[PDB]
Ligand binder design. Structure first.
Ligand SMILES: OC[C@H]1O[C@H](O[C@H]2[C@H](O)[C@@H](O)[C@@H](O)O[C@@H]2CO)[C@H](O)[C@@H](O)[C@@H]1O
Ligand SMILES: OC[C@H]1O[C@H](O[C@H]2[C@H](O)[C@@H](O)[C@@H](O)O[C@@H]2CO)[C@H](O)[C@@H](O)[C@@H]1O
Ligand code: NA
Ligand code: NA
Lengths: 173, 429, 173, 429
């Protein structure tokens, strides 16, 4: 049940304190103008001292040609739910986020962790994953599975064709 | 938590609340149902806070621009006037208060800013923004200030910005592109630059608010000011004979001021939804009721056809409509609350010379997207976040937290968003 | 370099002679009304006695709503090339077919063989394969590879966002 | 392989080829460029065969329905008449000969079938399909046959099919759906049923062809026949005074006959493309030239405005146009050649009672899709395939092949398709 369609490690030239502070107030910004509404639904410091943040993000896809016509028919905004945990002693910031908008159909899930750089506390390390789950089945499995579906289906039509042709053919003489 | 069998009515304290109170008295004398009119400080913010809990007034009065926010965050009831009633009011005003083809409030009157001047000091008012500094020098010489107006609300400065170029949201094909914000465009910068120059050149002062400027001009210490139909009544009783005229032109292009229709919405959390409709349709929106209000403070150009006729012989409504036509109507999109703070903070910074125009304005461009999901909560969201980012940094990360942060700003904010989610129908865990 | 998105074996209740004869005159038929033109480009009996047929099939996709408007703009017909070999002694009929229409972009390839039924010469056996090659790279690889592409790409925007926010944040005090 | 400095012109042998020949003589006398007019048997098939090689006539005459096939299989040149010339001819006829908004041939005349009857035997012709059997009995009694017409070409029987319902391709939104074929629909079956009944009831006979029926009716042995403007001339010289009128109605609905515009195309493999244009525009399509042809055999309703006027005083063109209006114009889609064989074979089967209507017609439905890729080659494709399926089964699988099969039918067929591919621009290995 595992298939991490991606995974990545990167480094910021900034101390975790400031990377984390900045991550809390990330939106809105010029590099992500599609993020139009961010709200903190709940926030708790837990028994162990870990700050928990649950945030909701609203995103408007950039298809500005028929948008006026389109939004009357249906909403143009996608929503992703987010869960972050800050440990201020061990200096880690986790962040697990799913889209809520089309999760019945598909479910992209991204996990991120910010800890200081083992070699230089001034730098910050960001490791990153992502799982696409098309139907709880990997993207690859699902996409191939479709090919089974229709390939064999069309195959099954061709065999009717043959029988019909043969029937006409057998009928000739 | 709203009581049944009364009515409570909020309207801003610069509006004609006593007049409106009188209209309630007639209502009480006829029905026996008590009416209470309030004018709470910072009402644009106060309504949302209380509305979210399920508290607040039965009826809320404000410029239509913030009603799209209010409605979509589940706070307003859909209004259901008869077809006959709608014919009674201009359809132009019904549109300002219509969101997703649902009517969300009753329009009351059309308002826009004009140039009010002192006819004893300025025989002929400047037609030109750029002529003012020159005039100030002459006027300072005779012991007076040329112009003074509210530099704290961005409404008053907006006309001068949207003059050479500058917009909230580009209007494309009958919809507003929320991704296109004309706060940071070329002329918007020149407009705002002009303003600040004027303070630097000693002509204005950044500190000036509404009251400061109302006082001075009505005292006769200044020649001009920029204000709305409401302000006329305090000028009248003062011994200054005044004119209202077009705003000076910037770059020989009209000064564009956003136009608002003062509308009246019915609280979603209100048992008295049918008393509120009768009071609004059968008492306020009549020649009688509207006069009462207008007598106390003028309404601008009423949306009631039958009283707008009896009124537009006023040479000041004339000048309001002139200026109203010269600018744009305000959007009632939810993103408006966001837009307003963005520019509000932009303007003062430039004015107090702390940030320069390009910086403050570039800032606004992006800050304009700082919407909440329940855009009625966008203001509460700002205050809670501004509180948390101070805490998180100063207290929590330094290991001095004593418990969950900014809990009281968070309390209400949470409720607004929660109500808004239901209205927007999002599904969460 | 192998990934047979599908594979199948089926049986006809008809003798290979007649299944093969009927396969030669398969089109046009009611079960495949999307096949509107079939032409034999070349046919040779080879030195070993094997009949070779190269056929071209034209197919019109069934999207009859805007077809009148659509065809003026561009052709609505897809083409598949076909190669068949008949051995009349060993009684086998192979058939390798590709689409020619969008092969630069993608290339579905189907292989079919008709021999008599080992247990009953009267019946005929049809085994069947199919290879999808999206870019000469399997469908699965290609489709996952896209996720790399954009996932990491969006990841790279988020890191700009962070820097910009941080720069503004660092600038405050 | 077409010679330069001559012209060679093909037109069907039922058309007025001598008349057309005379028009060439005037052309030769004026230019000195020789013109040769031929009438080759089965020309609808013969052109394609020769055109594919690069041989054939310079100019080809046929009903417009097969020209879309011809053109798209790379055999016809795009015609380029002046705007002034086009005004000379009806724009209705320019359309019949227009494919992918390119003109592919010159229209000459509009043709449709009518009822020709013997005025001495039928004082008043039956207006009703269903009245015929009853009439035949009376007529047989006086020693004659009521009706006789060409039962071999499906053109002649088509009107009776498309009467109660029945179509080649449904016409939807300005295009023909090639997937929708009305050969197997309910009324198409009833139409064809009626026909066969008539043979079974001894009234007609399945064997009757064109000549058989022309002979009998012009001999005075039969009262009616169904034919075109061309056939009138042989009736004239015979001592039978005749009328042309509307076709009998089936189920009280008009008999619908497909209409063709006899058009004239210029071979893609022709050096003489500008002689062919002058001959066609400046000699044939004139009052003079068209008369010459029409005198020899009538053209129906000419597409030249200036001669159609001088002609439509003819009470027979009148009746042609009546019937022409009562049916549909023929499609010039490439799928037409396919359609025609499908029905052609359908009809005889029913007629000779070998297949029954439902079988033969169901068969046609699908056989109508038996197009080649180069639809000009659809006929050659049939003959080669019909040859291979006989061989493959009888010879090759039985192990009696002596070499590659049906090599001569294959030879030409290959070339047509090859030319067609280039024109259609498909890429192969
Ligand atoms: O501020 C006084 C004056 O301005 C108002 O306009 C508002 C706008 O409607 C609000 O949404 C706010 O954030 O921005 C403007 C002020 O900056 C009212 O329209 C007007 O009645 C009121 O008197
Ligand atoms: O057959 C004589 C008569 O019919 C023709 O109509 C054709 C049609 O145009 C061809 O494409 C053919 O396959 O089908 C019909 C005959 O079944 C001609 O239009 C007409 O001039 C000709 O005399
Ligand atoms: Na999930
Ligand atoms: Na290939």
């Amino acid at each position: 049940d595992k298939m991490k369609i991606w995974t990545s490690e990167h480094v910021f030239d900034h101390p975790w304190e400031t990377v984390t502070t900045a991550a809390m107030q990330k939106y809105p910004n010029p590099m992500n103008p599609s993020v139009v509404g961010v709200d903190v639904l709940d926030r708790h410091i837990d028994p162990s001292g870990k700050l928990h943040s649950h945030r909701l993000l609203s995103t408007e896809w950039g298809l500005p040609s028929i948008v006026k016509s389109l939004i009357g028919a249906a909403r143009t905004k996608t929503y992703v739910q987010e869960h972050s945990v800050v440990d201020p002693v061990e200096k880690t910031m986790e962040l697990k986020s799913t889209n809520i908008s089309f999760t019945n159909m598909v479910s992209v899930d991204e996990r991120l962790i910010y800890k200081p750089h083992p070699q230089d506390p001034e730098k910050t390390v960001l490791t990153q994953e992502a799982i696409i789950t098309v139907k709880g089945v990997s993207l690859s499995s699902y996409l191939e599975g479709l090919m089974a579906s229709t390939i064999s289906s069309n195959a099954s039509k061709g065999r009717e064709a043959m029988e019909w042709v043969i029937h006409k053919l057998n009928a000739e003489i | 938590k709203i009581e049944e069998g009364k009515l409570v009515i909020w309207i801003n304290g610069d509006k004609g609340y006593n007049g409106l109170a009188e209209v309630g008295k007639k209502f009480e004398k006829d029905t026996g149902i008590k009416v209470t009119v309030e004018h709470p400080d910072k009402l644009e913010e106060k309504f949302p806070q209380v509305a979210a809990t399920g508290d607040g007034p039965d009826i809320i009065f404000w410029a239509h621009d913030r009603f799209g926010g209010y409605a979509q965050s589940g706070l307003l009831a859909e209004i259901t006037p008869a077809a006959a009633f709608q014919d009674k009011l201009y359809p132009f005003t019904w549109d300002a208060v219509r969101y997703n083809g649902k009517l969300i409030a009753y329009p009351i009157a059309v308002e826009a800013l004009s140039l009010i001047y002192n006819k004893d000091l300025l025989p002929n008012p400047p037609k030109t923004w750029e002529e003012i500094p020159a005039l100030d020098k002459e006027l300072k010489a005779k012991g007076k200030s040329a112009l003074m107006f509210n530099l704290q609300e961005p409404y008053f400065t907006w006309p001068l910005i949207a003059a050479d170029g500058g917009y909230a949201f580009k209007y494309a094909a009958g919809k507003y592109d929320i991704k296109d914000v004309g706060v940071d465009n070329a002329g918007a910068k020149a407009g705002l630059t002009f303003l600040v120059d004027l303070i630097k050149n000693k002509h204005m002062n950044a500190d000036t608010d509404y009251s400061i400027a109302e006082a001075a001009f009505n005292k006769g210490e200044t020649a001009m000011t920029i204000n709305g139909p409401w302000a006329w009544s305090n000028i009248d009783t003062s011994a200054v004979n005044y004119g209202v005229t077009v705003l000076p032109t910037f770059k020989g292009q009209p000064s564009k001021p956003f136009v608002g229709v003062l509308s009246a919405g019915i609280n979603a959390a209100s048992p008295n939804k049918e008393l509120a409709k009768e009071f609004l349709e059968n008492y306020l929106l009549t020649d009688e009721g509207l006069e009462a209000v207008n007598k106390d403070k003028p309404l601008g150009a009423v949306a009631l056809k039958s009283y707008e006729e009896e009124l537009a012989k006023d040479p000041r409504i004339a000048a309001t409509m002139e200026n109203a036509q010269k600018g744009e109507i305000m959007p009632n999109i939810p993103q408006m609350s966001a837009f307003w703070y963005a520019v509000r903070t932009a303007v003062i910074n430039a004015a107090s010379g702390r940030q320069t125009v390009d910086a403050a304005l570039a800032a606004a461009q992006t800050n304009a997207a700082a919407n909440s999901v329940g855009e009625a909560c966008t203001d509460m969201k700002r205050e809670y976040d501004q509180c948390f980012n101070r805490w998180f940094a100063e207290k929590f990360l330094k290991g001095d937290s004593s418990g969950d942060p900014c809990t009281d700003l968070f309390k209400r904010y949470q409720q607004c968003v929660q109500k808004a989610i239901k209205e927007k129908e999002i599904p969460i865990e």
